[PDB]
Design a protein around this ligand. Structure first.
Ligand code: 16G
Ligand code: 16G
Ligand code: 16G
Ligand code: 16G
Ligand code: 16G
Ligand code: 16G
Lengths: 266, 266, 266, 266, 266, 266
C-alpha cells in the first residue's frame, strides 16, 4: 500500500487528478480499448473533480475514450433530485468534460428489479474486462462504497441498508434532516473493488482519522471494510494532515520518507 | 454476513429448517441435478433436525433428491457407538426422512488410510460440483467443524488433533469422561467450507458469546476459525439471546432493524 | 499451521535440514522434473545450512536436480561484496554442494531496469511451475522476506524501501554502521510466497518473540506480514525456546502435544 | 458506578435536576452548613439547568444556602465576553435562581498570578470542607473538566493547554473559528474531582459514545481521564440513547434492570 | 503479587491452609489481640477448609483467638437454608473447629435495615482494627466477593445486585434453577478488601482462566474487580494447572522459578 | 504528565541536568533542610551525570547540602566490584562532586539481614521527610527501578528477583555473560517512588519505544510498572527521538507544542 501524506484537501485533489491523468495518458485509450475509471461522490472527491475539470479545459486530458462506473446510488431517490448520485456526477464532472454519454455507467436506484440491476451492472464491468483505477473515499465507520460494517469482504454489487450513523452523516446534503436520507443504496461490493487494477482512496479530515488507522495499522476485518485494501496488490491512500493523527509516528515517518520526491510538485 | 437475532433455540431451529426447506424447494432438485447439503452434529442442531423431520412428515420437503455431506467424524470410534457422528445423523435425521442411502456421505474415522479417506471425500464433493448450503455450529473456542485454533484458513479435509477443551466440552456425550472422548477427528477444512455457496451457522447459548463476537466483531484470524465467514460472500448466523451478549449495542441494533420482517413468522 | 517447539538453534537447523532432505528424497527429482527450493539469508538459516552441507557430504542428499530461488537481494550492493546476498549463498551453501550453476536463481540488485528484473524473476518461477518448499525467517517487525510493514498481502516481486529498524538490525553485518546498509532491496512478494506449496519459517531468539505471537496468535494484517501464513494451507514454523515466550501457555501446550513424537529424533 | 440509561437529553436533565434537588433537600443546608455544588458548562448541562430553574420557580428548591464551584474557565477571555464560562453560568443559571453572589465561586482566568488563583481556589473548597456533589460532562476524547489526555489522575487545580481537538469542538460557540477559542484554561484537576463526595456525569450524543465506553468498559488510564471514575466510591453516569451505542449488550442490559424502577418516573 | 503455580486443587488447599496456620501461629493471637481472618464461600475453598480442619484436629492450630469476617451473604434467603452462606460456613468449617460463636461475624441478609447492617459490619472490622489475612476466590468474570463488573474500586460494604451470569454460575447449588438463586447480596467492597493486610485468592479450574489473566496480565479496571489486587502491597494468587492456561509462557515461567523451592514441599 | 521531546541523549542529559540544578537552587538547601535527590544507574543517565558534573565544576551547583538515595543495588555482588551500583555511582558521579559521604545513601546488598536493610532504608527517607526529586530510567519491559512486571503498584523497598530478560539486558556490563548478572536486587518500590515530590524519567533509545508508549498511552497495570506515573501529580518524561516512535502522531504533536519554548534553549 502507498500512502501519500499531504497537508490539505486542495493538494490531495491535485495529486489524485494528476495521478488519474497520468494513468489515462500513459494508457493511451482507444475506442477498441478504453480506460475504465471507477468513481465516488460525497464531499471527499470535490477537490479532485475540480482539478480534473481544470486539466481537461487546459487540454491535459480527454475523456473521449474513458468509460466510467460509479460505486453506489441511493435507492428510491428520484434521478432528478439534486442530491441523487446521478445529479452529483453530472453537476460536478460529466457536464464539464468531453466524455460520451454512452461511456457513463450509473446504478439505477429506482430499478424495479433490484437484483437484476445489480447483476447487469457487474455484467457491464465484465464486458469491458476490468476497472483500471477505482477512486474512492472512506466513511467515518470505515466503509468503502456503502459496504457497511459486517459486509462480506468478498461481496458483489447488491443492495445494502445504510447504517444510522451514515445517514446522520449524509444528512448534511439533506438540509440536516436524517429522515430525508434514503435508507438503502445499490453499491458495488468489496470483491468488486478488489478486482480493480488499482485502488485510490482519498482521506480528508479528522473525522476519518480512525478509519485511516483501521486501514493502515488495523487487521483485516469486515467491520472496517476499508481494511480490504491490505489484500489489494495496488492500493494508494491520499491523505491530508488531520486524517493521519491516529497513526504511529513510525508509520508516518516511513511514508514521509517514501513519498518525499513523489509529493514535491511545488 | 446476515445475523438473525432470535430469542430461543426453538426459534433458531424453526428459522434454519425453514431456510433449508426454502432453498431446496426453490432449487427444485432432480436426480441429474441434486441439492447438496452440508451437515453438523452436536447439541446445537437438535432443534433444527426436529423441525426438519416435522416439515418432511407434513409433506413440506422431500430429501429424495438431496445429497448430504457431514463436516467431521471421530477417528477410531466404532461406527455403531451411539456417540459416533454416523450414529447421531441416523438417529436424529436420516432414519426419519426419505433420503436415499446412496445420497448420504460421511467420513470414515476408521479408514485404514486417513489421507486416502480425506482426499476421496473432497473428490466426492467435487464430482457433485459444490455444496449449495453448508449448515454448521461454532465451538466455544471459535472452531468451525474441527478446525481448531491455529488451523489454516485455506485448509482442506484432513485429520486434526482435538484441543483439550473441545474434548472436555464433548465429554458431555461420554458420560462426562474426557478420557473416553476421541483425541482425533477427520474434518472438512476452512477452505472446504468457504467453497460452499451459502454457509449457515447456528449459535446457541452464552457459552458461544465470545465466539460470536470473534466472528462478528473480530478480525480474520486462525485462532477463531469462525472468522473465516467474513471472507464468505454468503454467510448467515442464526442466534438466540444469550449468544449475543458480548456484541456492541450498535451491532445488534443494526441486525435487529435488518431482520425485523424476516424474523416475524409468528 | 504446524509449529515445532524446539530448544536450540542447533536443533532448529537439524529439524529444518532433515525436513528439506525428506521432501527432496520423497520427491525424487529428475532433470525433467526438478525440486524447486526457495531460500533465505541472514543469521537465522546458518544452522540449517550447516546441517544441509553435512548431510550432503554424508551422501544423504544431492542437489544435482534441485533448482533454487532466493527471496531477496540488496539494491546497489556490488555482487562481490562479502555481505551481498549472492555472496552469502555461495559462501555458506552453494560452494559446498553439488548443485548446477544453471540451477541457481538470484535477483540482480544492480539490474538497470528494476521492474524488468522483478518481472523476469516471477516469469522464471512460473516456467518451473511452482516452488515446492520455501524456507524463510522472520524479521523483528514481522516481515517475511523484505515485505516491510504496510506491504500488500497479495504483492509480487518488486523493489521495496527498507525500514529504518531493519537497517539498524542488519548493520550487524556492516560493522555496525547503519549508513552502510543498503536502503532498498528486490524482494519476492507475499503473494509470491503464498504460492509456494509449503512454507517453512525458522524462528530463533527472543528478538522474534513478538513476531511469533503476531504470526501464531495475531490476526491477518499487513503490518506483520508473517501473518500471511494463516492463509497458507501448508505452513510450518520451527522455533527455539526464547522465541516462544510471548505465546499463551495453552498454545504452546497444544503444539507440544502435537509434535512430541515428530521432534524426538534424539 | 451507577449508569442511568435514558432516551432523551430532556430526560437526562429532568433526572439529573431531580437528583440535585433531592440531595440538597435531604441535606438541609443552612448558613453555617451550606451544600457545596460543583458545576460544568458546555452544551451538555443545558436541559439540567433548565429543569433546575423550573423546580426552583415552582418553589421546590432554594439555592440561598448552596455554595457553588465551577470546574474551569478560559484564560485571557474577558469576563463579560458572551462565551466566558462566567457569562454562560449567569445567563443560564445564576440569573434565574436565588443564589447570593457570595456563594458563587468561579475561576478567574484573568488573574495577575495564575498560580495563586488556582491555589486559592483549592483553598476555598477546603475551607468549606467538601464538595457534596460535582456535576460535569465528558469530552469527546473523554476529558473531564479541562483535564485533557495525559493529565495526572492525581492532579489539582491548575492552568492547562487545550487539545486542538477540544478547541475544534468548542469553536461552535465562537462562530466555528478555531482561531477564536482560547488555547489555555484554568481547571480543577482529577484529584479535586475525586475528592467530591459524589460525582454525576451527564453523557449526551453519539459523539460521546466512545468516551462512555472508555469510562464504563475501559481500564483506568490518563488518556481518557473520565476513567478516573472507576476509583470513585460514589459515581453516577446519566445517559441518553445514542451515547450507549458502543457498550456491550450485557453491559446495558445489567444497568437497565438495575435502574428499571428508578427511571419509570418518566 | 505472588502467584503460586500448583497442579491440583488438593495442593492449592494444602498450600493455602498451611499459609493461614503459619501466619496465625507467627502472630500469636490472644484474647486482647486476636488474629482477624476474612473468609469466602463457593466451591473454590473446599479443599482449604478441609486441610485446615485436618491441621486443627492434629493440634496444629487453634481458632480460639481468631475473629473471622465473611465476604458476603444472600439477601432474603433464610439463615437456616442449606445454601445460605451462614449454613455453608458452619457445615464446612465452624462445626469442626474450636472457634467461639463470639468470634464469628457474618453479614445478616435478613436485617430490617440493610443500610445499617453494612455500616455496622464495616464498624466491626474497624473496632478490631485490621483484617490480617483475607482469603477469597474469583468469579468467572473476575468479580471478587460480590463486587460485580462496574463496582467501584473504592467501594465499601453494601447491598449488591448480582449479574445474571453469576446467578447461572451459582444455580448449581440450587438444583440448576436460576430462578432459585437470590438476585441480591450484601458484600464487602473492593475498598474493604484492599484494607486487608494480606489478600490470598484461590484460583481453581479452566472457568477461571480468563479471570486469572485479567488479574495478572490485564490493566486495572472495574469490569474485572479482581484486577484491584495490582494496587495491593501484599497479594497472593494460589492456582491449579488449568487456571493458568491463558497466561503467557514467560509469565508462568517467571513465577515457577520464584516459587520453585516454595512449592516443592509437596 | 509532561513529556519533553528531544532529539539526542546529549540534549536529554543537558535538559535533565539543568532541571535538577534549577530545583536545587530554587530550594536553597542548608544543613537543616537538605534537598533530597533520588538517583538511578544504567546507561540511561550517563549524559545527565556528565552535564551535572560540568555545571558543578563551573560553580553552578553544589551538593554540599543534598542528600541522595539510590533506587537499587545488586545482592551478593561485592561493593568494590566495578559493576556494583555503589562503584557506578562513585566512578560516575560522587567522585567528581562535593557531596559529603554522610549524604550518600545506597542500599547494602550484602547486609546480613536483607529484611532489616530495606526497612531501615525506608526509615532513612522518612527521617528526612520527603524525596524532592527522583530521577530514574525505564527498562525495556517498562520496569522502573527493579520493580519487575507483576510488582505491586503499592510496593515498598524490598528484595526482588530479576526477570531473565533484565539480566540479558544487563549482561552488557558483565561481558555479555548472562550467568554473571545477579539474580536478585534490593530496590525501592513503586510506592516509595510515588511518594517522591517529583519524578523525572529519562527515556533513551529505540529499545524503550514500547515502554514509553505503555507509560504515556497505556493503562495502569503492574506488568509495565512505569505506568504508575499516571497516578503521580508531578511526573516528567524526557525523551530522545527514537524512543517516541510508537506514540501517536497526535500525542507527540501535543507535547511538541507544549514544550516548544521549553526546549528551544538548545
Ligand atoms: C434488502 C437488503 O438490505 N439486503 C441485504 C443483502 O443484500 C446483503 O447481502 C445482506 C448482508 O450481506 P453482505 O453485506 O455480506 O452482502 O444484508 C441484507 O440482507
Ligand atoms: C495427525 C495430525 O494431527 N495431523 C495434523 C495435520 O493434518 C494438520 O495439517 C496440521 C495442522 O495444519 P492445518 O491445521 O493448518 O492443516 O496438524 C497436524 O500435523
Ligand atoms: C521505489 C519503491 O520503493 N517502490 C515501492 C513499490 O515497489 C511498492 O509497490 C510500494 C508499496 O506497495 P506494496 O508494498 O504494497 O507493494 O512502495 C514503493 O512505492
Ligand atoms: C502552562 C501549562 O500548560 N502548564 C501545564 C502544567 O500545569 C501541567 O501540570 C503539565 C501537565 O501535567 P498534569 O496535567 O499532569 O498536571 O503541563 C503543563 O506544563
Ligand atoms: C440496591 C442496589 O443494588 N444498590 C447498589 C448500590 O449499593 C451500589 O452502590 C450501586 C453501584 O455502585 P458501586 O458498585 O460502585 O458501589 O448500584 C446499586 O444502586
Ligand atoms: C525473595 C523475593 O524475591 N521476594 C519477593 C518479595 O519480596 C515480593 O514481595 C514478592 C512479589 O511481590 P511485590 O513485587 O508485589 O512486592 O515476590 C517475592 O517473594
Amino acid at each position: 500500500m502507498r500512502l501519500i501524506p499531504l497537508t490539505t484537501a486542495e493538494q490531495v485533489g491535485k495529486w489524485a487528478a494528476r495521478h488519474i491523468v497520468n494513468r489515462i495518458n500513459a494508457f493511451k485509450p482507444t475506442a477498441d480499448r478504453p480506460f475504465v475509471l471507477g468513481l465516488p461522490t460525497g464531499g471527499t472527491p470535490m477537490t479532485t473533480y475540480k482539478a480534473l475539470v481544470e486539466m481537461h479545459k487546459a487540454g491535459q486530458v480527454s475523456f473521449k475514450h474513458v468509460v466510467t462506473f460509479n460505486m453506489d446510488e441511493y435507492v428510491g431517490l428520484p434521478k432528478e433530485h439534486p442530491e441523487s448520485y446521478y445529479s452529483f456526477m453530472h453537476r460536478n464532472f460529466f457536464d464539464h468534460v468531453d466524455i460520451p454519454a454512452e461511456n457513463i455507467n450509473l446504478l439505477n436506484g429506482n430499478a424495479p428489479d433490484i437484483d437484476a440491476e445489480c447483476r447487469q451492472y457487474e455484467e457491464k464491468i465484465r464486458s469491458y474486462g476490468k476497472i483500471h483505477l477505482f477512486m474512492g473515499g472512506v466513511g467515518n465507520d470505515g466503509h468503502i462504497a456503502f459496504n457497511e460494517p459486517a459486509s462480506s469482504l468478498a461481496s458483489r454489487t447488491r443492495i445494502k441498508t445504510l447504517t444510522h450513523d451514515t445517514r446522520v452523516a449524509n444528512s448534511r446534503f439533506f438540509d440536516n434532516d436524517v429522515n430525508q436520507v434514503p435508507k438503502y443504496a445499490l453499491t458495488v461490493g468489496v470483491g468488486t473493488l478488489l478486482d480493480a487494477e488499482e485502488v485510490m482512496i482519498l482521506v480528508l479530515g479528522s473525522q476519518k482519522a480512525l478509519a485511516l488507522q483501521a486501514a493502515v495499522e488495523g487487521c483485516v476485518n469486515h467491520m472496517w471494510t476499508i481494511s480490504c485494501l491490505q489484500l489489494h496488490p495496488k492500493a494508494i491512500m491520499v491523505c491530508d494532515e488531520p486524517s493521519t493523527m491516529e497513526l504511529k509516528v513510525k508509520t508516518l515517518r516511513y511514508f514521509n520518507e517514501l513519498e518525499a520526491e513523489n509529493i514535491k510538485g511545488l
